[PDB]
């Protein structure tokens, strides 16, 4: 309930500085996409900088692929 909502907020508060150091321009979007997955992987990404990089690099490619689809329309 509201406890899991606070858990999801604080996980974003821990992930955002690390992602902002990695990808500062689109840090807010990558944190929002990564926050959708289960919390078990989120706690692992904070302990391993390599696992965080893999999820962030996957998230940046997702936004890049969606921007091309949105540009193909108008």
């Amino acid at each position: 309930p509201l406890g899991s909502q606070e858990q999801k907020q604080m996980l974003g508060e821990r992930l955002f500085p690390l992602i902002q150091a990695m990808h500062p321009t689109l840090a807010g979007k990558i944190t929002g996409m990564l926050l959708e997955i289960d919390n078990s992987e989120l706690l692992h990404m904070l302990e391993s900088p390599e696992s965080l990089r893999s999820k962030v690099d996957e998230a940046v490619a997702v936004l890049q692929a969606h921007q091309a689809k949105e540009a193909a329309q108008k």
């Binding site: 508060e13 955002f16 807010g28 944190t31 929002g32």
Partner: peptide
């Protein structure tokens, strides 16, 4: 493995949208 590009943006200090 599925990531949503339309996921709500996370801004520190304000409650995240799509919060269930």
């Amino acid at each position: 493995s599925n990531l949503n590009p339309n996921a709500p943006e996370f801004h520190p200090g304000v409650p995240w949208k799509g919060l269930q």
